[PDB]
């Protein structure tokens, strides 16, 4: 047994906390119970030994960048998140989230994560993005940004499907290990 810090940020327009809570609950897709409190945690092994793990559910509102860095120190791994279907999310992460994280924490294994994987290939979502001239940005460019940081990994998933989500957390835990 042992505990692992795991900070997670990302804008509030993507509902990453839904991802976290669905994972922790081991709930059915689309059947999570939204709690009232943040900063989730669990205790599973990815390999060999069971370990505690704590997910610092952090609100992505930019103002709180005076409080969130106080959470940063001695964090084993951080998880940077976005929406695969929000170009604004990309601009924020490449422009604000990623740079400030690299600044505050220049020494920590990092994994980028996509979101709404189904909606990336959802015809209606992508046609809305085109009619609104937003880009249904695909994997290779997120991969390019991951190479830009050289993040130890990047994965993309969908909440309503949890596809690779369990895996996402598996590499997340093994990042410490």
């Amino acid at each position: 047994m042992q505990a692992i810090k795991c900070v997670v940020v990302g804008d509030g327009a993507v509902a990453k906390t839904c991802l976290l809570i669905s994972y922790t609950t081991n709930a059915f897709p689309g059947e999570y119970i939204p709690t009232v409190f943040d900063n989730y945690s669990a205790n599973v092994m990815v390999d060999g030994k069971p370990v505690n793990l704590g997910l610092w559910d952090t609100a992505g509102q930019e103002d709180y960048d005076r409080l969130r860095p106080l959470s940063y120190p001695q964090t084993d791994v951080f998880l940077i998140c976005f929406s695969l279907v929000s170009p604004a999310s990309f601009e924020n992460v490449r422009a604000k989230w990623y740079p400030e994280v690299r600044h505050h924490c220049p020494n920590t294994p990092i994994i980028l994560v996509g979101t709404k994987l189904d909606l990336r290939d959802d015809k209606d979502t992508i046609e809305k993005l085109k009619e609104k001239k937003l880009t249904p940005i695909t994997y290779p460019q997120g991969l390019a940004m991951a190479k830009e940081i050289g993040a130890v990994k990047y994965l993309e998933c969908s909440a309503l499907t949890q596809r690779g989500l369990k895996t996402v957390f598996d590499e997340a835990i093994r990042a410490v290990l």
């Binding site: 081991n26 999570y32 939204p34 069971p50 369990k166």
Partner: protein, 275 residues
């Protein structure tokens, strides 16, 4: 056979299962089965029936002595079964039989040595909590006992839902999974082409007997948080009413689905149907 009461072949198949669990190291389950065998015996000296005089070794075996041997083995199991509560339980009447009938005071010493060791184990060590998943069988192509049946599986300590789910899918062909996890399918209540849906359920707390008020330490609690369980509830989210955006609590109405099964986990099967 229990229905047919031909206890000999009954014991035979019991030992078959004992071999099986030994293969699977279900020391808990193996010990349970062995106990059911031992359950038949009496502390009477007389071996009243050579039926239970099995092929492992066949001679006098005064009945209480055979009971004694069984109890030693079951204790050994539970001890390596990482479940010492039943160990202490059984040890109690084992020592009672010693003092009352055989007076085997050296055996008393060994037995109580073991009991103290187990008490130390309980107070000291920590053990993992095993997840419990419900399995809903649906379709016609299932076996008779499987067709449109619901089961709950005493999962491993830390299997995630889809890990166990996929392992079960390995157990089966036609591994199509449902998405309306809570309600069944009436079509599939009659359709062929076996359907299933699986998910975790909540192990309802036991009643700690005679413990309802004492400031008992954690070990007692955590042990009863896992085992000797029979009730299993499943949370049911639902939007009931008006779904205002800022207030998800405006419509949360939980149709908490609970389950009662025949037997108390853990048991002689790592799974059971809902009763």
């Amino acid at each position: 056979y229990k229905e047919k009461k031909r206890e000999d072949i009954y014991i035979r198949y019991l030992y078959k299962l004992r071999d099986l669990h030994r293969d699977c190291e279900n020391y808990t389950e193996a010990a349970y089965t062995l106990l059911l065998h031992a359950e038949l015996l009496q502390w009477s000296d007389k071996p009243c029936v050579p039926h239970l005089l099995q092929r492992d070794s066949y001679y006098v075996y005064t009945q209480q002595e055979l009971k004694e041997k069984l109890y030693q083995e079951i204790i050994s199991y539970f001890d390596k079964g990482k479940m010492w509560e039943k160990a202490i339980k059984l040890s109690k009447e084992l020592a009672e039989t010693y003092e009352s009938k055989v007076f085997d005071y050296e055996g008393l010493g060994n037995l109580l040595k073991k009991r103290a060791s187990f008490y130390e184990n309980i107070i000291k060590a920590m053990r993992p909590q095993p997840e419990y998943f419900a399995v809903g069988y649906y379709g016609q192509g299932f076996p008779s006992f499987l067709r449109n049946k619901i089961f709950i599986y005493r999962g491993k300590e830390y299997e995630r839902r889809e890990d166990f789910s996929l392992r079960l899918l390995t157990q089966f062909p036609n591994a199509e999974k449902m998405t309306s996890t809570t309600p069944p399918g009436e079509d599939i209540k009659s359709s062929p082409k076996q359907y299933m849906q699986c998910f975790t359920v909540k192990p309802v707390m036991s009643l700690p007997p005679s413990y309802k008020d004492k400031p008992v330490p954690e070990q007692i609690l955590n042990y009863y948080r896992a085992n000797e369980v029979q009730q299993f509830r499943y949370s049911r989210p639902f939007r009931k009413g008006e779904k205002d955006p800022d207030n998800e609590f405006a419509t949360m109405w939980i149709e908490r689905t609970t389950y009662t099964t025949a037997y108390t986990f853990p048991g002689i099967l790592k799974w059971f149907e809902v009763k």
